[PDB]
Design a protein around this ligand. Structure first.
Ligand SMILES: CC(=O)N[C@H]1[C@@H](OP(=O)(O)OP(=O)(O)OC[C@H]2O[C@@H](n3ccc(=O)[nH]c3=O)[C@H](O)[C@@H]2O)O[C@H](CO)[C@@H](O)[C@@H]1O[C@H](C)C(=O)N[C@@H](C)C(=O)N[C@H](CCC(=O)N[C@@H](CCCCN)C(=O)O)C(=O)O
Ligand SMILES: CC(=O)N[C@H]1[C@@H](OP(=O)(O)OP(=O)(O)OC[C@H]2O[C@@H](n3ccc(=O)[nH]c3=O)[C@H](O)[C@@H]2O)O[C@H](CO)[C@@H](O)[C@@H]1O[C@H](C)C(=O)N[C@@H](C)C(=O)N[C@H](CCC(=O)N[C@@H](CCCCN)C(=O)O)C(=O)O
Ligand SMILES: Nc1ncnc2c1ncn2[C@@H]1O[C@H](COP(=O)(O)OP(=O)(O)O)[C@@H](O)[C@H]1O
Ligand SMILES: Nc1ncnc2c1ncn2[C@@H]1O[C@H](COP(=O)(O)OP(=O)(O)O)[C@@H](O)[C@H]1O
Ligand SMILES: [Mg+2]
Ligand SMILES: [Mg+2]
Ligand SMILES: [Mg+2]
Ligand SMILES: [Mg+2]
Lengths: 493, 493
């Protein structure tokens, strides 16, 4: 469509050159701007991409959106605006014909549980034979096709393009993880949600938000930004076991569905039975109480699966049909996965990376420890360290603790492991600068009948190293390789 | 329409009795429930209206929405829901066919300036010969027809009904004052806004919000609740002279128009000339700079009128035509009105009732004081007193200060005036339990050529007294009557 039409949407602009040209692309990354692209320049944490306008011109781009007039050949049109990224979201949603309005969109936010819930919703939709897309930490997925990405909630143009890809692939719904960063930074501007789901609010990301108050307020935006049009069928799904839900009710007019285990709620889990092979519980609902069998491990995953079921139910699918679908749902990659159960030890991977997440992981696994719990965890580089010793304390619930860096980036890895060590409550721990070395050590220490847990990465396939360089790393593969060496078994070679 | 259709909108409900009946009315006030009404019961600060269901049944109402099953005759249908008021807003907007979606809606929030801006927008629309409605502290107005009300932002059902009245009267737009109370309490659930306008955030209402942080976050809801549908033409108008605007930008994706006097902004006022008869200024805009003549007094009203002009402009009216309309706009009742200029004193009424508002009032009037400034102010009963001595300090910018109660309700009036007195910085003040007595005293003290200001009530026609009883009271009429007695003039009698 033509640039004229697109920029009618923008009231304050200084236009230098013609808007007659056809536009089929928008990008905030100069490296992909071409003839027919709009390149929107912006100020990042690393570079100001206004510096790259000449590059995009060389590549044939004839239209740039900028905060200040640039030095460029006269045949490149410049649109000067006060807020380039705000305009990028307007342009992108317009160009792609409002992709978020074209399918059912589910959004999940919370300190822990975003990937779990979002993936469970996706997997339920697929079990119901519906085309479904997912975007989050585990990347972008349309039905069974997966590609990895750099963020949980990617920057606005990339994100909008992916919603448009889901629409074009024929998705009936798409579920997005909604990071508090993404909300505050405008990455989700223009993304209309139909159902908003909350897991919990516990201490994290204060390097970015400064305070718990600001952090909670950031997550509330997913709920208030649903808007005020009561002719729309929109719904909010809240966790009554988290006290922040009381506040969330006040910021949106749409009907609220509550779930709970400890606290009274509209949907509850009772008579919970746990195993390393999944759970059963009685699912109390406003319409009746029904037996549920779930393949997921732990009470925290009962909260998560209830959130997922209620979200799908809210848009018109019968609970009976959802409960049937949940029974043999596939694993959520990296989230409490029991590896090769034929081993003479329990070998579990999990993504726990905050104190609360670790407590929930250990709560779930500990009842099944026959002998000793061997627990490896990493601390992420370049993140707030204030709750790191607390993570070290929680880890010392285990019998033997291994501390490692996780994505140390430019941080000294020994500083990360030493910070974890400051919280230890017993002397049975060890620190490794190299996480792979730490994993092999965990297997060295493990006896038949022991339980080994590798926490904070799941199957995340890299360590972010100095210069922010990704080096290949797989907890699961390193763990298994070390385990087969020690105990035997494993596929032929 | 029939109750069945209405309640299809509510997913969690326990229905006792038939929904076949016709519904033409909804009410949260039992006193107006009749056959064909839905009565929604709720828990207020004073009474739980669930107690009144039998009354509504006696009056012929056959449908109640309740949080718990009630004792009622079997022929009354009960719909039991978890959140009655949330359902009231859903039912009301549905029943009245989404009245806020049917005209352009402007919403104004801020500590001071809501009535001023909202009224200015209304008056501009009328000057442009467009049907316009206004709802706020000065009541409900459709074109020139006014009725008074109990709140700035009335409870959800009454508010929705008034939007529906504006639609039915043929209004092309309606402007609502948006109180932080109204936002938090859900009074505006279902009210879609097209333009949101911010004035300022200064200390007020902490008896309700507890903190400035929570208070600011409450006002941010007007902006985030605009939603995320970028196919809609919605706009945000922010004051760059207020530091809270930086935060407000982050909570909405829509284009932001900024105004400013002290700080750089897209729309600014320069070369400001002031009189008691209005102002002139050069209005810098993104499209050019234009001379503006405004009948309103003071720099604070220049901020307000710029906000009003930009809001109307944003929905497609030319600035030139708006600027012409502003020239002889009518007064905003109670807000810096110069009374009978034929008097040998300046006699001014104004609604200033916080420290910041008082400073802005005194800033506006002081350059025109030839001799002495005689300044009367009241403190509201049953409100947070923490900034009351500060109000007393600000008042002592005047030469002679009179302290009175304003709507003391059940508070001891002497406690209110004494709290004001604690901030005084000179000895030239006096306190009166009776505000009318204080006004007459102000005139007693005034010499020809003096300036008398009566602040905090405007033309508000009552004092709220013990038992929360309204007794007639008019600052303007009492002031004028006393002034004519002392100085002569005034209409024959
Ligand atoms: C601090 C931050 O925000 N940098 C994000 C930001 O970089 P920069 O601003 O530095 O980019 P830069 O300045 O290079 O470029 C600015 C702009 O210029 C463009 N430009 C750049 C170069 C060029 O040649 N041409 C060009 O046009 C570029 O496309 C961009 O539009 O823009 C990128 C692109 O959009 C994101 O990819 C980055 O995200 C990183 C990966 C991140 O780690 N971000 C974190 C802070 C984050 O967003 N986290 C949340 C939550 C997830 C999370 O935090 N998870 C935990 C997990 C912990 C357990 C791990 N085992 C954690 O990481 O702590 C999320 O991803 O949604
Ligand atoms: C504390 C509060 O919120 N009580 C509001 C609230 O009463 P209650 O909860 O006590 O009502 P109650 O408990 O009696 O009844 C509950 C429910 O039962 C129903 N019910 C009641 C009786 C009955 O016979 N039958 C029946 O069905 C009734 O309709 C209601 O649905 O419900 C009313 C109806 O909806 C409002 O009219 C009240 O608002 C008062 C007037 C107020 O003063 N409210 C203030 C707190 C307020 O809302 N302020 C903002 C901002 C304006 C402001 O604060 N301005 C300053 C001005 C200062 C300068 C003045 N010169 C100030 O006042 O400080 C605003 O109005 O939007
Ligand atoms: N609802 C929950 N409450 C507490 N901890 C949880 C919850 N869900 C998952 N976790 C823990 O946190 C880790 C991260 O879960 P995930 O669903 O990836 O959260 P997020 O996507 O918000 O980071 C899991 O591997 C598990 O240890
Ligand atoms: N923009 C402003 N900034 C500061 N004070 C103002 C502003 N506008 C009005 N005031 C002062 O506050 C009083 C109340 O103004 P009004 O527009 O009624 O505000 P609100 O409706 O928010 O209470 C006025 O009479 C004036 O003294
Ligand atoms: Mg998080
Ligand atoms: Mg995630
Ligand atoms: Mg106020
Ligand atoms: Mg007002």
């Amino acid at each position: 469509m033509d640039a004229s039409t697109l920029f009618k949407k923008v009231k304050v602009k200084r236009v230098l050159g013609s808007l007659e040209q056809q536009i089929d692309d928008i990008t905030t990354d100069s490296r992909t701007a071409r003839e027919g692209s709009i390149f929107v320049a912006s100020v990042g944490y690393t570079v100001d991409s206004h510096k790259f306008c000449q590059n995009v011109a060389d590549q044939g781009c004839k239209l740039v959106v900028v905060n200040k007039e640039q030095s460029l050949p006269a045949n490149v049109t410049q649109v000067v605006v006060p807020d380039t990224l705000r305009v990028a979201s307007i342009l992108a949603h317009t160009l792609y014909d409002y992709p978020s309005h074209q399918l059912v969109t589910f959004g999940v936010t919370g300190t822990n549980g975003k990937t779990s819930i979002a993936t469970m919703i996706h997997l339920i939709q697929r079990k119901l034979q519906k085309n479904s897309a997912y975007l989050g930490t585990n990347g972008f997925q349309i039905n069974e096709t997966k590609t990895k990405g750099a963020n949980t909630t990617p920057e606005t143009v990339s994100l909008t393009k992916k919603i448009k890809e889901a629409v074009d692939a024929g998705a009936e719904s798409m579920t997005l993880e909604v990071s508090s960063h993404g909300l505050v930074l405008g990455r989700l501007r223009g993304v209309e949600f139909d159902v908003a789901i909350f897991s919990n609010l516990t201490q994290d990301h204060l390097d970015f938000h400064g305070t718990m108050e600001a952090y909670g307020h950031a997550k509330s935006l997913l709920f208030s930004q649903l808007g005020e049009d009561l002719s729309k069928e929109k719904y909010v799904v809240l966790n009554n076991d988290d006290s922040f839900s009381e506040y969330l009710r006040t910021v949106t007019p749409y009907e609220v569905f509550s779930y709970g285990i400890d606290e009274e709620a509209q949907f509850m889990a009772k008579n919970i039975q746990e195993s390393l092979q999944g759970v059963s519980f009685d699912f109390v609902t406003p319409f009746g109480t029904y037996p549920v069998k779930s393949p997921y491990v732990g009470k925290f995953n009962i909260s998560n699966i209830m959130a997922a079921m209620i979200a799908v139910w809210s848009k018109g699918t019968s609970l009976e049909t959802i409960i049937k679908a949940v029974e043999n749902l596939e694993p959520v990659e990296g989230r409490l996965e029991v590896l090769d159960p034929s081993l003479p030890i329990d070998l579990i991977i999990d993504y726990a990376h905050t104190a609360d997440g670790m407590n929930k992981l250990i709560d779930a696994v500990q009842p099944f420890v026959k002998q000793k719990l061997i627990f490896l965890v990493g601390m992420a580089g370049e993140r707030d360290l204030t709750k790191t010793p607390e993570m070290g304390r929680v880890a010392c619930r285990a019998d033997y603790v291994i501390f490692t860096p996780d994505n140390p980036a430019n941080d000294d890895p020994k500083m990360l492991t030493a910070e974890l060590a400051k919280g230890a409550t017993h002397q049975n721990y060890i620190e490794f600068d190299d996480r792979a070395e730490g994993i092999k050590h965990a297997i060295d220490i493990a006896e038949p009948g022991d339980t080994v847990v590798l926490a904070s990465k799941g199957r995340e396939p890299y360590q972010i190293m100095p210069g922010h360089i990704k080096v290949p790393h797989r907890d699961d593969l390193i763990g298994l390789e070390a385990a087969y060496k020690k105990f035997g078994g494993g596929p032929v070679d």
